[PDB]
Amino acid sequence: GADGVGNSSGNWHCDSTWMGDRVITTSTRTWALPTYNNHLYKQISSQSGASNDNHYFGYSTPWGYFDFNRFHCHFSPRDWQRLINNNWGFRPKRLNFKLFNIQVKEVTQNDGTTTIANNLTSTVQVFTDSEYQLPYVLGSAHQGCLPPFPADVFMVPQYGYLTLNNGSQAVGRSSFYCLEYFPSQMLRTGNNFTFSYTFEDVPFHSSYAHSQSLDRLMNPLIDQYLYYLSRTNTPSGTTTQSRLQFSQAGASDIRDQSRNWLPGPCYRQQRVSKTSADNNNSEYSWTGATKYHLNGRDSLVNPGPAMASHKDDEEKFFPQSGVLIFGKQGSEKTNVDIEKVMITDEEEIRTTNPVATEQYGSVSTNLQRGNRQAATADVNTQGVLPGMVWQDRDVYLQGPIWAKIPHTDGHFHPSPLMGGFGLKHPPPQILIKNTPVPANPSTTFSAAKFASFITQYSTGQVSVEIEWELQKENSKRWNPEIQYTSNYNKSVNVDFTVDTNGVYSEPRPIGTRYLTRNL
Amino acid sequence: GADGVGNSSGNWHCDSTWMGDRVITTSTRTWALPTYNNHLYKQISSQSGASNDNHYFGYSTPWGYFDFNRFHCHFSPRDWQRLINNNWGFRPKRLNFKLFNIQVKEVTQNDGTTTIANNLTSTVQVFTDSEYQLPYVLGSAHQGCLPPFPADVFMVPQYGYLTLNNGSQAVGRSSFYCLEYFPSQMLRTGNNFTFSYTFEDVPFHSSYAHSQSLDRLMNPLIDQYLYYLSRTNTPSGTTTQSRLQFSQAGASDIRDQSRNWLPGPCYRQQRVSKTSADNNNSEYSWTGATKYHLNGRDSLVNPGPAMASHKDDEEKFFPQSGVLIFGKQGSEKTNVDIEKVMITDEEEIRTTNPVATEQYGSVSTNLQRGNRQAATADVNTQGVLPGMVWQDRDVYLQGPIWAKIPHTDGHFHPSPLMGGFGLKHPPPQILIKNTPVPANPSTTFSAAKFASFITQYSTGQVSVEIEWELQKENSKRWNPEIQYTSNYNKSVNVDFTVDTNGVYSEPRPIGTRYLTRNL
Amino acid sequence: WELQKENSKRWNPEIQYTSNYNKSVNVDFTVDTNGVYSEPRPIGTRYLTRNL
């Protein structure tokens, strides 16, 4: 579609429709794109004496990009509530992406006055890779996503990537990608950009919590037919001789009953308390953290495998890194106090998954004999064993929607750690750039490259439409469920609403597990 | 096909054709088959006081067999270079096997003179099992494969297998297979043998190395929206009180960024250096080695799970058992010095896999509290967890092509450890035998079995044709790749070439990972 | 462009054009920290070998 200068290239669509099998969410925002790096690529690398773990080597590019990968882009807090309360599962099906009403502005800064004028003949160039030939940045939980609240205007983030490094020095295998080298549609004012995308078949996300736990999956009324060792020694009344005896497990001792399944795997965490008095006084943020080790550099495992955050009535404590932590509106980047952050809580997974701060179990250390006593050891890390079941981490409201499974010889249970849908072919990246306009070349010829350009930026609207598939809840539970409810009491401000200054805010993380299924 | 005595039963085919989707490699060799065990089965068992780990019980058979299972049989060093440099992946599709120009020779040793004469009426009998009813020997990396260089004549190896044992004594479940008990084609001079085979669908081998690592998969320019604990305590200036604080992770600290994936699993190795001065002076070849334990007998895990051999600039060090080690041409069986062996190096896997000689990471040992300091422990062995990705070991040039997945209730990620293609139904075994010819029975009848036979051997040509499927490399990388190049400098001998004596040699292992894909 | 493919029976490997494997401050044929693209060496087109 190519219109004139005065025709509008596309309408505003921000909507949600519910067909009861499907929900189709649409959102439209206004974006503003500057020129990054003065129209030129650069390499960037870890600064000077940065620690061995912090070294990196990569390139920054003039290009920007769009990321809708956060849920709250697509769902309003009320739309999120219909889904969360009424449904067992959901997955995306197909999406559509449309750019329109582009306009490019040249700015002239003279003295203190800056005049911003339309540049009608300038262009903006956009491409979507869709063959996945670029480093895929999305899914790293970077900022720059479409704003939660539709009236916001957002700046388009700059695109950059990292490659192999030794220290800050590059390695011969490190790749350099020139984004100018791909076919891209060039858009002048009165052109629009579109593409549609179809998600590959993916398991539903589970929005339900279990009403039973692995430990307690059996009829309390009836005894098992399987014996266990109830006791190992019997008294002679002067001394206790060694005689081993057996019992059928039943309501009296539940812990001894033969069970047919095992909890999910654990990689242990350190426990810290929200009350500042209970925590130790030392710097253990790093030396005490749980880490993994590649190529001689440690990396904190922030998300971790999916685990319950705390046991019964422990709500005070939370794992050191083991949870997602969101900031409240207007929170600074660094060294911000506990009251500012919003800490998510996974306790709905207690049933099938171990508590992140405690060990999987205990294991016999040695072979007993008449002269030596039996001994056991604690298993702080457990890989997958046959017959283990587990729940995936919850997606919440502002968490990421998807991630790209790396392309590798093998991978186990592709579901991402931060939550969301593992996608082998995720939604492609959309990269956008202001085409350079030179400024007043010299009359004599010079073979050097231009250092002078017209200063300009562009703006327009972006529209994303995703189609979601729903899994309805059919259950015979007699008594009421738990629902997500906005509190009835009065308040100065309404939750999920602008304040007197016009600042939209999200009071708490909303995770998707309320409705209950039996295990 | 049955020809006369004077007709040739088949032509020599040694060729390589490239259709650009497919490459079809053909190779023809000359074989010589003796008579093993004097035409009779035997049982063999561990000798006398051999150590508990070394006990075995099995049978040796008169039969020989053919194994083409090494790559260099099919590929020439130049053919291997077109594949390695130009392609991301390859797998086999279908193969064909043909035997022809068989001739049987009787030898008569009298005094010192030995005359070798054609025996025209003698036969050779050959069968391929194809129902997998025999112990499958192939894939154990035994010698006796077709020679690398087509002008070589090779002896056909003897066939034998092992079964259950207790000590050197057999167990009632141990099976005895009589190879005379299967249908087999009997080939006289002027007969040929053929069969064709179709590989079951198998994942491509990955001939590419990654241009990114799991640690560094995110945009360095943009901060995350997810907090972590930056610090745990704040000074009052007389003392440091305990106050826990948060930060958004960014270019400044990369190690703290929330990451969505984990490195592959590790089973730790001991590190040894190629420089003889750095290694400890003690016998730790065994007591220090990493092992697994079945039925009361330890076994060295030589291949190990796929792991990077060393970190950055460690090229000196290599894992104790953790690598494949090939001998240079003309290397003795036992106690051979470091200069004779060719040690392979896996460092191209550093990105997704842990270094074999160092631990997966660290894990919190205990629950901290105001009065006790937090502590951590090292995890030297890590099973698979959800969200782990890894690369399989590289196949090289002279490594094995495939292996047979054992038939069992369950198996995880069937890809073999030595490298190559796990095949549930691999190429069947081809077994070959010289039919016994008695010598001058007595005129009177005797019910005893013959101890006297004509001494003879057979020879002919064998031809193997495999069809391979290729995965082409489509990538937008701007700068040049790394290629496999024969050095330009002058030398006395050319690499991969016969010397002045006629001895073919392979100077170095050639592994298949050069071209680079982004992770 | 029209290409003439290489069909040859040479047994041993060829010579190829390879970017060196060793580490470096800058990557060859790549922008530097200032954004200046550069070509380190001339690349001539004769590598593969035909017999005369």
PDB file of C-alpha atoms in Angstrom, chain A residues 83-309:
ATOM      1  CA  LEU A  83      -7.708 -15.542  30.840  1.00  0.00           C
ATOM      2  CA  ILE A  84      -6.166 -16.219  34.223  1.00  0.00           C
ATOM      3  CA  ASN A  85      -9.387 -16.990  36.096  1.00  0.00           C
ATOM      4  CA  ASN A  86     -11.330 -18.917  33.470  1.00  0.00           C
ATOM      5  CA  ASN A  87      -8.743 -21.051  31.704  1.00  0.00           C
ATOM      6  CA  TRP A  88      -6.411 -23.988  32.266  1.00  0.00           C
ATOM      7  CA  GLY A  89      -4.046 -23.230  29.405  1.00  0.00           C
ATOM      8  CA  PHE A  90      -3.259 -20.969  26.503  1.00  0.00           C
ATOM      9  CA  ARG A  91      -0.824 -20.801  23.626  1.00  0.00           C
ATOM     10  CA  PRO A  92      -0.326 -18.406  20.724  1.00  0.00           C
ATOM     11  CA  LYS A  93      -1.363 -19.412  17.217  1.00  0.00           C
ATOM     12  CA  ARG A  94      -0.658 -16.771  14.605  1.00  0.00           C
ATOM     13  CA  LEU A  95       0.281 -13.109  14.744  1.00  0.00           C
ATOM     14  CA  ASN A  96       0.271 -10.117  12.429  1.00  0.00           C
ATOM     15  CA  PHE A  97       2.478  -7.031  12.313  1.00  0.00           C
ATOM     16  CA  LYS A  98       1.745  -3.763  10.542  1.00  0.00           C
ATOM     17  CA  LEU A  99       3.559  -0.388  10.432  1.00  0.00           C
ATOM     18  CA  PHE A 100       1.877   2.756   9.217  1.00  0.00           C
ATOM     19  CA  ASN A 101       1.715   6.545   9.296  1.00  0.00           C
ATOM     20  CA  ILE A 102       5.472   6.922   9.108  1.00  0.00           C
ATOM     21  CA  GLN A 103       6.807  10.454   9.083  1.00  0.00           C
ATOM     22  CA  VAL A 104      10.398  11.679   9.087  1.00  0.00           C
ATOM     23  CA  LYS A 105      11.481  14.912  10.748  1.00  0.00           C
ATOM     24  CA  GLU A 106      14.666  16.883  10.200  1.00  0.00           C
ATOM     25  CA  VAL A 107      15.839  18.958  13.148  1.00  0.00           C
ATOM     26  CA  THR A 108      18.039  22.040  12.802  1.00  0.00           C
ATOM     27  CA  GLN A 109      19.845  23.206  15.935  1.00  0.00           C
ATOM     28  CA  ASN A 110      21.049  26.799  15.657  1.00  0.00           C
ATOM     29  CA  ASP A 111      21.926  28.903  18.710  1.00  0.00           C
ATOM     30  CA  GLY A 112      19.513  27.671  21.400  1.00  0.00           C
ATOM     31  CA  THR A 113      16.541  27.365  19.072  1.00  0.00           C
ATOM     32  CA  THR A 114      15.804  24.023  17.415  1.00  0.00           C
ATOM     33  CA  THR A 115      13.242  23.865  14.620  1.00  0.00           C
ATOM     34  CA  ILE A 116      11.740  20.506  13.675  1.00  0.00           C
ATOM     35  CA  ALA A 117      10.383  20.342  10.139  1.00  0.00           C
ATOM     36  CA  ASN A 118       8.865  17.627   7.985  1.00  0.00           C
ATOM     37  CA  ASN A 119      11.254  16.040   5.532  1.00  0.00           C
ATOM     38  CA  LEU A 120       8.874  14.614   2.976  1.00  0.00           C
ATOM     39  CA  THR A 121      11.293  12.839   0.669  1.00  0.00           C
ATOM     40  CA  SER A 122      13.275  11.021   3.345  1.00  0.00           C
ATOM     41  CA  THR A 123      12.865   7.281   3.765  1.00  0.00           C
ATOM     42  CA  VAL A 124      12.910   4.670   6.497  1.00  0.00           C
ATOM     43  CA  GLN A 125      14.041   1.141   5.703  1.00  0.00           C
ATOM     44  CA  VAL A 126      12.741  -1.941   7.501  1.00  0.00           C
ATOM     45  CA  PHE A 127      13.273  -5.659   7.144  1.00  0.00           C
ATOM     46  CA  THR A 128      12.349  -8.809   9.010  1.00  0.00           C
ATOM     47  CA  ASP A 129      14.934 -11.558   8.769  1.00  0.00           C
ATOM     48  CA  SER A 130      12.592 -14.566   9.091  1.00  0.00           C
ATOM     49  CA  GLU A 131      15.427 -16.888   8.088  1.00  0.00           C
ATOM     50  CA  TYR A 132      17.012 -16.369  11.511  1.00  0.00           C
ATOM     51  CA  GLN A 133      20.338 -15.313  10.022  1.00  0.00           C
ATOM     52  CA  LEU A 134      21.158 -12.749  12.728  1.00  0.00           C
ATOM     53  CA  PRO A 135      22.013 -13.016  16.405  1.00  0.00           C
ATOM     54  CA  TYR A 136      18.621 -13.253  18.051  1.00  0.00           C
ATOM     55  CA  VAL A 137      18.461 -10.676  20.825  1.00  0.00           C
ATOM     56  CA  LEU A 138      14.855 -11.125  21.883  1.00  0.00           C
ATOM     57  CA  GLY A 139      14.090 -13.220  24.916  1.00  0.00           C
ATOM     58  CA  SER A 140      16.928 -11.793  26.989  1.00  0.00           C
ATOM     59  CA  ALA A 141      14.403  -9.680  28.939  1.00  0.00           C
ATOM     60  CA  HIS A 142      15.783  -6.357  27.766  1.00  0.00           C
ATOM     61  CA  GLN A 143      13.934  -3.095  28.136  1.00  0.00           C
ATOM     62  CA  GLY A 144      12.480  -1.247  25.176  1.00  0.00           C
ATOM     63  CA  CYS A 145       9.330  -3.306  24.705  1.00  0.00           C
ATOM     64  CA  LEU A 146       6.037  -1.682  23.822  1.00  0.00           C
ATOM     65  CA  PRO A 147       4.743   0.181  26.882  1.00  0.00           C
ATOM     66  CA  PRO A 148       2.083  -1.424  29.067  1.00  0.00           C
ATOM     67  CA  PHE A 149      -0.318   1.482  28.784  1.00  0.00           C
ATOM     68  CA  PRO A 150      -1.459   2.382  25.269  1.00  0.00           C
ATOM     69  CA  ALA A 151      -1.135   6.146  25.608  1.00  0.00           C
ATOM     70  CA  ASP A 152       2.641   5.949  26.014  1.00  0.00           C
ATOM     71  CA  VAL A 153       5.157   6.814  23.304  1.00  0.00           C
ATOM     72  CA  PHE A 154       8.347   4.782  23.384  1.00  0.00           C
ATOM     73  CA  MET A 155      11.833   5.075  21.958  1.00  0.00           C
ATOM     74  CA  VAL A 156      12.971   2.235  19.712  1.00  0.00           C
ATOM     75  CA  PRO A 157      16.018   0.451  21.183  1.00  0.00           C
ATOM     76  CA  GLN A 158      19.378   0.132  19.478  1.00  0.00           C
ATOM     77  CA  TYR A 159      20.483  -3.217  18.093  1.00  0.00           C
ATOM     78  CA  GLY A 160      23.761  -4.843  19.068  1.00  0.00           C
ATOM     79  CA  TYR A 161      25.145  -8.310  19.555  1.00  0.00           C
ATOM     80  CA  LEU A 162      28.061 -10.189  21.079  1.00  0.00           C
ATOM     81  CA  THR A 163      30.372 -12.851  19.662  1.00  0.00           C
ATOM     82  CA  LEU A 164      33.298 -15.007  20.734  1.00  0.00           C
ATOM     83  CA  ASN A 165      36.015 -13.355  22.771  1.00  0.00           C
ATOM     84  CA  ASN A 166      39.230 -14.090  24.606  1.00  0.00           C
ATOM     85  CA  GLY A 167      39.511 -11.471  27.278  1.00  0.00           C
ATOM     86  CA  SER A 168      38.296  -8.430  25.401  1.00  0.00           C
ATOM     87  CA  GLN A 169      40.107  -9.617  22.271  1.00  0.00           C
ATOM     88  CA  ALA A 170      38.243 -11.244  19.411  1.00  0.00           C
ATOM     89  CA  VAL A 171      38.705 -14.818  18.240  1.00  0.00           C
ATOM     90  CA  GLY A 172      38.983 -15.810  14.594  1.00  0.00           C
ATOM     91  CA  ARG A 173      35.569 -17.473  14.705  1.00  0.00           C
ATOM     92  CA  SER A 174      33.757 -14.319  15.825  1.00  0.00           C
ATOM     93  CA  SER A 175      31.283 -13.211  13.179  1.00  0.00           C
ATOM     94  CA  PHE A 176      30.505  -9.732  11.893  1.00  0.00           C
ATOM     95  CA  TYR A 177      27.059  -9.078  10.444  1.00  0.00           C
ATOM     96  CA  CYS A 178      26.346  -6.061   8.260  1.00  0.00           C
ATOM     97  CA  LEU A 179      22.648  -5.290   8.448  1.00  0.00           C
ATOM     98  CA  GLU A 180      22.884  -3.144   5.318  1.00  0.00           C
ATOM     99  CA  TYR A 181      23.507  -6.423   3.515  1.00  0.00           C
ATOM    100  CA  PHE A 182      19.970  -7.783   3.698  1.00  0.00           C
ATOM    101  CA  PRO A 183      16.997  -6.968   1.454  1.00  0.00           C
ATOM    102  CA  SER A 184      14.904  -4.321   3.158  1.00  0.00           C
ATOM    103  CA  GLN A 185      11.776  -2.421   2.230  1.00  0.00           C
ATOM    104  CA  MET A 186      12.336   1.328   2.094  1.00  0.00           C
ATOM    105  CA  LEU A 187       9.360   3.300   3.369  1.00  0.00           C
ATOM    106  CA  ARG A 188       8.698   6.918   2.534  1.00  0.00           C
ATOM    107  CA  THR A 189       5.800   8.849   4.053  1.00  0.00           C
ATOM    108  CA  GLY A 190       2.696   7.150   2.751  1.00  0.00           C
ATOM    109  CA  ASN A 191       4.049   3.600   2.697  1.00  0.00           C
ATOM    110  CA  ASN A 192       3.258   0.851   5.170  1.00  0.00           C
ATOM    111  CA  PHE A 193       4.921  -2.388   6.230  1.00  0.00           C
ATOM    112  CA  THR A 194       3.268  -5.706   7.042  1.00  0.00           C
ATOM    113  CA  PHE A 195       3.976  -9.296   7.721  1.00  0.00           C
ATOM    114  CA  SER A 196       2.177 -12.175   9.351  1.00  0.00           C
ATOM    115  CA  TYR A 197       3.577 -15.108  11.278  1.00  0.00           C
ATOM    116  CA  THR A 198       2.307 -18.499  12.402  1.00  0.00           C
ATOM    117  CA  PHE A 199       3.553 -20.050  15.618  1.00  0.00           C
ATOM    118  CA  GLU A 200       4.730 -23.625  15.393  1.00  0.00           C
ATOM    119  CA  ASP A 201       2.805 -26.122  17.481  1.00  0.00           C
ATOM    120  CA  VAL A 202       3.724 -25.699  21.145  1.00  0.00           C
ATOM    121  CA  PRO A 203       2.427 -27.147  24.401  1.00  0.00           C
ATOM    122  CA  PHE A 204      -0.100 -25.075  26.293  1.00  0.00           C
ATOM    123  CA  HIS A 205       1.174 -23.164  29.255  1.00  0.00           C
ATOM    124  CA  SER A 206      -0.350 -24.534  32.437  1.00  0.00           C
ATOM    125  CA  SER A 207      -2.301 -21.837  34.257  1.00  0.00           C
ATOM    126  CA  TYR A 208      -3.534 -24.318  36.875  1.00  0.00           C
ATOM    127  CA  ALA A 209      -2.201 -25.372  40.261  1.00  0.00           C
ATOM    128  CA  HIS A 210      -2.517 -28.890  41.624  1.00  0.00           C
ATOM    129  CA  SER A 211      -4.944 -29.869  44.375  1.00  0.00           C
ATOM    130  CA  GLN A 212      -2.734 -32.814  45.336  1.00  0.00           C
ATOM    131  CA  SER A 213       0.973 -33.346  45.849  1.00  0.00           C
ATOM    132  CA  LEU A 214       3.204 -36.238  44.830  1.00  0.00           C
ATOM    133  CA  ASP A 215       3.716 -37.202  48.434  1.00  0.00           C
ATOM    134  CA  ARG A 216       0.008 -37.703  49.005  1.00  0.00           C
ATOM    135  CA  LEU A 217      -1.605 -39.413  46.017  1.00  0.00           C
ATOM    136  CA  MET A 218      -3.226 -42.409  47.724  1.00  0.00           C
ATOM    137  CA  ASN A 219      -6.402 -43.592  49.442  1.00  0.00           C
ATOM    138  CA  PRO A 220      -5.859 -43.032  53.167  1.00  0.00           C
ATOM    139  CA  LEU A 221      -8.493 -45.602  54.064  1.00  0.00           C
ATOM    140  CA  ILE A 222      -6.896 -48.718  52.563  1.00  0.00           C
ATOM    141  CA  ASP A 223      -3.543 -50.284  53.385  1.00  0.00           C
ATOM    142  CA  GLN A 224      -0.996 -51.189  50.764  1.00  0.00           C
ATOM    143  CA  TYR A 225      -0.044 -54.782  50.100  1.00  0.00           C
ATOM    144  CA  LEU A 226       3.658 -53.854  49.987  1.00  0.00           C
ATOM    145  CA  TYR A 227       5.896 -54.185  53.050  1.00  0.00           C
ATOM    146  CA  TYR A 228       8.768 -51.920  54.108  1.00  0.00           C
ATOM    147  CA  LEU A 229      11.228 -52.188  56.987  1.00  0.00           C
ATOM    148  CA  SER A 230       9.305 -50.767  59.928  1.00  0.00           C
ATOM    149  CA  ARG A 231      12.142 -51.482  62.386  1.00  0.00           C
ATOM    150  CA  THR A 232      15.663 -52.932  62.353  1.00  0.00           C
ATOM    151  CA  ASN A 233      16.275 -54.215  65.878  1.00  0.00           C
ATOM    152  CA  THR A 234      14.395 -55.852  68.729  1.00  0.00           C
ATOM    153  CA  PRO A 235      15.109 -55.685  72.474  1.00  0.00           C
ATOM    154  CA  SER A 236      16.201 -58.669  74.506  1.00  0.00           C
ATOM    155  CA  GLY A 237      15.601 -56.399  77.520  1.00  0.00           C
ATOM    156  CA  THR A 238      19.200 -56.477  78.638  1.00  0.00           C
ATOM    157  CA  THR A 239      20.223 -55.223  75.188  1.00  0.00           C
ATOM    158  CA  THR A 240      18.589 -54.689  71.814  1.00  0.00           C
ATOM    159  CA  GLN A 241      19.552 -57.448  69.386  1.00  0.00           C
ATOM    160  CA  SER A 242      19.523 -56.828  65.642  1.00  0.00           C
ATOM    161  CA  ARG A 243      16.352 -58.259  64.089  1.00  0.00           C
ATOM    162  CA  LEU A 244      14.762 -56.692  61.027  1.00  0.00           C
ATOM    163  CA  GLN A 245      10.989 -56.466  60.684  1.00  0.00           C
ATOM    164  CA  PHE A 246       8.431 -55.365  58.122  1.00  0.00           C
ATOM    165  CA  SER A 247       5.108 -53.562  57.992  1.00  0.00           C
ATOM    166  CA  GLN A 248       2.422 -52.683  55.488  1.00  0.00           C
ATOM    167  CA  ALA A 249       2.217 -48.942  55.058  1.00  0.00           C
ATOM    168  CA  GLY A 250      -1.052 -47.245  55.854  1.00  0.00           C
ATOM    169  CA  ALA A 251      -2.731 -44.157  57.232  1.00  0.00           C
ATOM    170  CA  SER A 252      -0.658 -44.425  60.417  1.00  0.00           C
ATOM    171  CA  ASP A 253       2.644 -43.905  58.575  1.00  0.00           C
ATOM    172  CA  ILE A 254       2.143 -42.147  55.251  1.00  0.00           C
ATOM    173  CA  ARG A 255       5.807 -41.327  54.688  1.00  0.00           C
ATOM    174  CA  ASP A 256       6.678 -45.006  54.288  1.00  0.00           C
ATOM    175  CA  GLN A 257       4.138 -45.810  51.577  1.00  0.00           C
ATOM    176  CA  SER A 258       5.532 -46.992  48.274  1.00  0.00           C
ATOM    177  CA  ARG A 259       5.228 -44.151  45.805  1.00  0.00           C
ATOM    178  CA  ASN A 260       5.301 -44.405  42.065  1.00  0.00           C
ATOM    179  CA  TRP A 261       6.763 -40.984  41.167  1.00  0.00           C
ATOM    180  CA  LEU A 262       9.507 -38.532  42.157  1.00  0.00           C
ATOM    181  CA  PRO A 263       9.735 -34.751  42.495  1.00  0.00           C
ATOM    182  CA  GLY A 264      11.399 -32.625  39.859  1.00  0.00           C
ATOM    183  CA  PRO A 265      15.108 -31.846  39.744  1.00  0.00           C
ATOM    184  CA  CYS A 266      16.844 -29.335  41.985  1.00  0.00           C
ATOM    185  CA  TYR A 267      19.879 -27.084  41.780  1.00  0.00           C
ATOM    186  CA  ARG A 268      20.107 -25.626  45.256  1.00  0.00           C
ATOM    187  CA  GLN A 269      19.859 -21.930  46.167  1.00  0.00           C
ATOM    188  CA  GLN A 270      20.816 -19.770  49.122  1.00  0.00           C
ATOM    189  CA  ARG A 271      17.972 -18.507  51.291  1.00  0.00           C
ATOM    190  CA  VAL A 272      17.567 -14.832  52.166  1.00  0.00           C
ATOM    191  CA  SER A 273      14.848 -13.204  54.249  1.00  0.00           C
ATOM    192  CA  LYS A 274      12.865 -10.076  53.452  1.00  0.00           C
ATOM    193  CA  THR A 275      13.264  -8.996  57.089  1.00  0.00           C
ATOM    194  CA  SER A 276      16.634  -7.266  57.266  1.00  0.00           C
ATOM    195  CA  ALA A 277      17.408  -8.608  60.744  1.00  0.00           C
ATOM    196  CA  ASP A 278      17.448 -12.317  59.902  1.00  0.00           C
ATOM    197  CA  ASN A 279      20.016 -12.161  57.098  1.00  0.00           C
ATOM    198  CA  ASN A 280      23.694 -12.631  57.856  1.00  0.00           C
ATOM    199  CA  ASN A 281      25.935  -9.574  57.901  1.00  0.00           C
ATOM    200  CA  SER A 282      28.539 -10.278  55.230  1.00  0.00           C
ATOM    201  CA  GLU A 283      28.947  -9.828  51.494  1.00  0.00           C
ATOM    202  CA  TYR A 284      27.729 -13.142  50.095  1.00  0.00           C
ATOM    203  CA  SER A 285      25.920 -11.757  47.085  1.00  0.00           C
ATOM    204  CA  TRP A 286      28.547 -13.357  44.916  1.00  0.00           C
ATOM    205  CA  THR A 287      30.727 -15.709  46.991  1.00  0.00           C
ATOM    206  CA  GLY A 288      27.551 -17.287  48.345  1.00  0.00           C
ATOM    207  CA  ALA A 289      25.560 -17.327  45.126  1.00  0.00           C
ATOM    208  CA  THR A 290      24.953 -20.417  43.023  1.00  0.00           C
ATOM    209  CA  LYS A 291      26.764 -20.356  39.713  1.00  0.00           C
ATOM    210  CA  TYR A 292      27.728 -22.270  36.605  1.00  0.00           C
ATOM    211  CA  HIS A 293      31.088 -22.363  34.896  1.00  0.00           C
ATOM    212  CA  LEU A 294      31.909 -22.029  31.196  1.00  0.00           C
ATOM    213  CA  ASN A 295      35.291 -21.529  29.580  1.00  0.00           C
ATOM    214  CA  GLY A 296      36.837 -20.359  32.823  1.00  0.00           C
ATOM    215  CA  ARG A 297      34.205 -17.760  33.646  1.00  0.00           C
ATOM    216  CA  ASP A 298      31.488 -18.146  36.282  1.00  0.00           C
ATOM    217  CA  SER A 299      27.960 -16.929  35.649  1.00  0.00           C
ATOM    218  CA  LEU A 300      25.221 -16.441  38.207  1.00  0.00           C
ATOM    219  CA  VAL A 301      22.221 -18.645  37.431  1.00  0.00           C
ATOM    220  CA  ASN A 302      19.559 -16.024  38.122  1.00  0.00           C
ATOM    221  CA  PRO A 303      16.336 -17.709  36.890  1.00  0.00           C
ATOM    222  CA  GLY A 304      17.318 -21.236  37.904  1.00  0.00           C
ATOM    223  CA  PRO A 305      15.272 -24.346  37.259  1.00  0.00           C
ATOM    224  CA  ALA A 306      11.650 -24.063  38.286  1.00  0.00           C
ATOM    225  CA  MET A 307      11.316 -24.601  42.028  1.00  0.00           C
ATOM    226  CA  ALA A 308       9.060 -23.702  44.901  1.00  0.00           C
ATOM    227  CA  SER A 309      10.378 -20.588  46.588  1.00  0.00           C
TER     228      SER A 309
END
